[PDB]
Design a protein around this ligand. Structure first.
Ligand SMILES: [Zn+2]
Length: 57
């Protein structure tokens, strides 16, 4: 259960919470996360995004 963050607004993405109400349910691979996804605070082209996501191992 990793978590990412945007180096713009500073929004942490916890797969344990995610934005299931945005076409992205918890426990989702950042990879699967459709580029359509845009930080609700600093959208972002998913380019300024890093870290990990989705719970595993
Ligand atoms: Zn953000």
């Amino acid at each position: 259960g990793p978590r990412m963050q945007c180096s713009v607004c500073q929004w942490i993405y916890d797969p344990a919470k995610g934005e299931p109400m945005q076409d992205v349910a918890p426990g989702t691979p950042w990879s699967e996360v459709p580029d359509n996804f845009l930080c609700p605070e600093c959208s972002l082209g998913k380019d300024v995004f890093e870290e990990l996501a989705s719970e595993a191992k």
